[PDB]
A paper describes a structure:
Newly made messenger RNAs are processed and packaged into ribonucleoprotein complexes (mRNPs) and recognized by the essential transcription-export complex (TREX) for nuclear export.
The 28-subunit TREX core comprised the tetrameric 24-subunit THO complex (THOC1, -2, -3, -5, -6, -7) and four copies of UAP567,28. The contacts of UAP56 RecA1 and RecA2 lobes with the THOC2 ‘stern’ and ‘MIF4G’ domains, respectively, can explain how THO stimulates UAP56 ATPase activity, by promoting UAP56 opening.
Author numbering:
A (entry chain B): 14 to 23, 39 to 57, 72 to 80, 83 to 100, 107 to 119, 142 to 183, 188 to 257, 262 to 290
B (entry chain E): 38 to 47, 52 to 75, 80 to 144
C (entry chain A): 10 to 22, 29 to 38, 44 to 65, 71 to 84, 91 to 120, 133 to 167, 227 to 278, 296 to 334, ...
D (entry chain G): 6 to 14, 23 to 41, 45 to 102
């Protein structure tokens, strides 16, 4: 009957008493009745005691079941990788509708490269436009407007100043590999980029078919 | 939920945290300097300290999440107000450009 | 062994002195602890970049340090340290950038958001027809959500408002400091009508929407013929644009053609 | 399943630190374990300080947002003045 007396008897002092009750229950190794006789703090202390006892057999499992009254790993990994660090770039074209629409409507206006650079940066920031797709759309608008060449060349030089030099090579390689399995405009763009030394001949040459 | 805001509002929590850390340091120094009954008492107090630390960490994480959520809500409200002000400024600029 | 922690705290407080006084992984761990502690001292009481550079030149830790600092320093030294990291040129960088993006409001930090994304890429009274306004911006809401164009009443209302708005577009016949997002001006309502670039926005959105729809998830044959006819009318409208209407149309055609290639999801 | 996974949200780091401490203690070379426990406790102290600093930063951000809202009210007043000018 000593256990019943100890239970009936019993925020520094309150926390100390709760920890002492948890330690006594752990040293017990029927208690559910006394636990329900008296709270949310009690439930939290019971959960902490169960966690510690699991950290510290069949008897423990039975006590946990009484007090209750593999793929999960990959699922949690996927959930955390998506929530915490997601690329979230809105790559293709149609995800960000307003974004690419306003981008192309800004590139196709009547014809200062710094102002357009700042506008494109603001659009990237506001609509989360992927940078590589922005460069691709810029290269294509440069294809279809072969009159204003030096303007887009200064824009391409300033943009690639803030990106990796091998982005243009791989993007041109993608735009050429698309037609492998080739209009004159595509060759004209690569020739202009190669002339002004924006990209090296090695990467583009490797990307070609023959 | 009001209890969490009350406990967060009213440095004393960090002082009690560091004081319990000093208690746990004294207990592990006692074990390193050191009978089965004293070892069991000591281990029970160490486990109680660990549980207290776990509860404090959970409370702090929940409070940080709530604070970040409130800050995000305030940021959204400020962004909406700024978008309204930007629409007004765009209207004024376009009216000055047409006139 | 904590004597080694005290020795590290002492010899860490320019670079050659700590480099010589250091003359094994547990010692490095205690040194990283001392680094974090002195960083906490500095942030409570810039030089943080100096210490991170010292540790980097000593070489792990510095990514954790930058993460903690960016979690602490709210706005300005955060910008300075981000520029510093830009000058410095793994997953911790992604975590920091994502937390920054989640903290920014995109209201006045837009250029900063653009810089962050570019770095991430470098890594790897007057009679007002309020009903017409309702119709136009409900069309805009349709633009925002493409999946809404599969139910019955949704598609029906979309068709109704689209026909009315394009009829107004064709009947207008114009024949003639930066706003990144749309401006729903209920008192102006008209200066956007006079802008040809506004009409270009609208019609290019239309074209991208129809291109995605042509690429469950099925349509009615009559609806598809409607899509084709409206595409033709949209091209007609784009041709009416005084500044190089046909050149702009051909440019958009090449764009949406390349769009088909991009839709091949070149994951390989 | 998904609800508990979301409520798990850092928290994993503190949970793993507490778990490693409990495991080492149950195992209790003893000086090395005590020093590892001291390292873990110092890391937990740094984490608590970081949480306090994050709370202070959230408070300062709320204050700055209130200041920006006052500034936006002033900008709306300036917009009314610019409407008179218009």
């Amino acid at each position: 009957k000593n256990w019943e007396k100890s239970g009936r008897g019993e925020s520094s002092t309150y926390r100390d008493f709760q920890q002492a009750l948890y330690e006594l229950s752990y040293h017990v190794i029927d208690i559910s009745e006394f636990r329900e006789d008296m709270i949310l703090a009690d439930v939290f202390c019971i959960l902490d005691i169960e966690t510690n006892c699991l950290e510290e057999f069949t008897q423990l499992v039975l006590a946990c079941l009484y007090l209750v009254s593999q793929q999960f790993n990959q699922k949690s990994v996927k959930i955390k990788t998506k929530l915490f660090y997601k690329q979230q770039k809105f790559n293709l074209l149609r995800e960000e509708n307003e974004g690419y629409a306003k981008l192309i409507a800004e590139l196709g206006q009547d014809l200062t490269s710094d102002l357009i650079l700042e506008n494109i940066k603001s659009l990237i920031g506001c609509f989360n436009l992927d940078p590589n797709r922005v460069l691709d759309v810029i290269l294509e608008v440069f294809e279809c407007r072969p009159e204003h060449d030096d303007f887009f060349i200064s824009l391409l030089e300033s943009y690639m100043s803030m990106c990796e030099p091998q982005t243009l090579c791989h993007i041109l390689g993608f735009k050429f590999k698309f037609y492998q399995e080739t209009p004159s405009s595509l060759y004209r763009v690569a020739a202009v980029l190669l002339q002004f030394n924006l990209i090296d001949l090695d990467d583009l040459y490797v990307h070609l078919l023959p | 939920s009001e209890e969490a805001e009350v406990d967060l509002r009213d440095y004393e929590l960090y002082k009690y945290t560091c004081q319990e850390l000093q208690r746990l340091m004294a207990e592990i120094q006692d074990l390193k300097s050191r009978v089965a009954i004293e070892i069991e008492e000591r281990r029970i107090q160490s486990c109680v300290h660990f549980m207290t630390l776990k509860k404090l960490n959970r409370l702090a994480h929940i409070r940080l999440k709530k604070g970040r959520d409130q800050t995000h809500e305030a940021k959204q409200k400020v962004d909406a107000y700024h978008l309204q002000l930007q629409n007004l400024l765009y209207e004024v600029m376009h009216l000055q450009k047409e006139i | 062994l904590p004597e080694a922690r005290t020795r590290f705290t002492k010899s860490t407080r320019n670079i050659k002195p700590l480099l010589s006084t250091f003359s094994e992984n547990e010692k490095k761990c205690t040194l990283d602890q001392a680094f974090r502690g002195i960083l906490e001292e500095e942030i409570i009481n810039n030089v943080l970049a100096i210490i991170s550079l010292a540790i980097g030149g000593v070489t792990s830790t510095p990514f954790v340090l930058l993460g903690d600092v960016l979690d602490c320093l709210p706005l300005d030294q955060c910008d300075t340290i981000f520029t510093f990291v830009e000058k410095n040129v793994k997953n911790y960088l992604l975590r920091m950038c994502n937390d920054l993006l989640r903290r920014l409001s995109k209201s006045q930090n837009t250029v900063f958001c653009g810089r962050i994304q570019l770095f991430l890429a470098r890594l790897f009274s007057i009679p007002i027809d309020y009903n017409l306004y309702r119709k136009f911006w409900s069309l805009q809401d349709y633009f925002r959500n493409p999946v809404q164009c599969y139910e019955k009443i949704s598609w029906k209302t979309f068709l109704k408002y689209s026909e009315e708005v394009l009829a107004v577009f064709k009947s207008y016949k114009l024949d003639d400091v930066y706003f990144a997002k749309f401006l729903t001006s209920e008192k102006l309502m008209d200066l956007q009508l006079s802008d040809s670039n506004f009409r270009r926005h609208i019609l290019l959105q239309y074209l991208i929407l129809f291109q995605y729809l042509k690429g469950n998830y099925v349509l009615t044959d009559e609806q598809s013929l409607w899509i084709e006819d409206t595409t033709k009318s949209v091209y007609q409208l784009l041709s009416e644009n005084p500044p190089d209407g046909e050149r702009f149309s051909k440019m958009v055609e090449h764009i949406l053609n390349t769009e088909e290639n991009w839709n091949s999801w070149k994951n390989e | 399943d998904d609800e508990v996974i979301r409520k798990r949200l850092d928290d994993r780091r503190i949970n793993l630190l507490v778990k490693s401490f409990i495991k080492w203690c149950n195992s209790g070379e003893g000086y090395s374990q005590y020093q590892r426990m001291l390292s873990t406790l110092s890391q937990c102290e740094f984490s608590m300080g970081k949480t306090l600093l994050v709370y202070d930063m959230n408070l300062r951000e709320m204050e700055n947002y209130e200041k920006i809202y006052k500034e936006i009210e002033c900008s709306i007043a300036g917009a009314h003045e610019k409407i008179a000018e218009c």
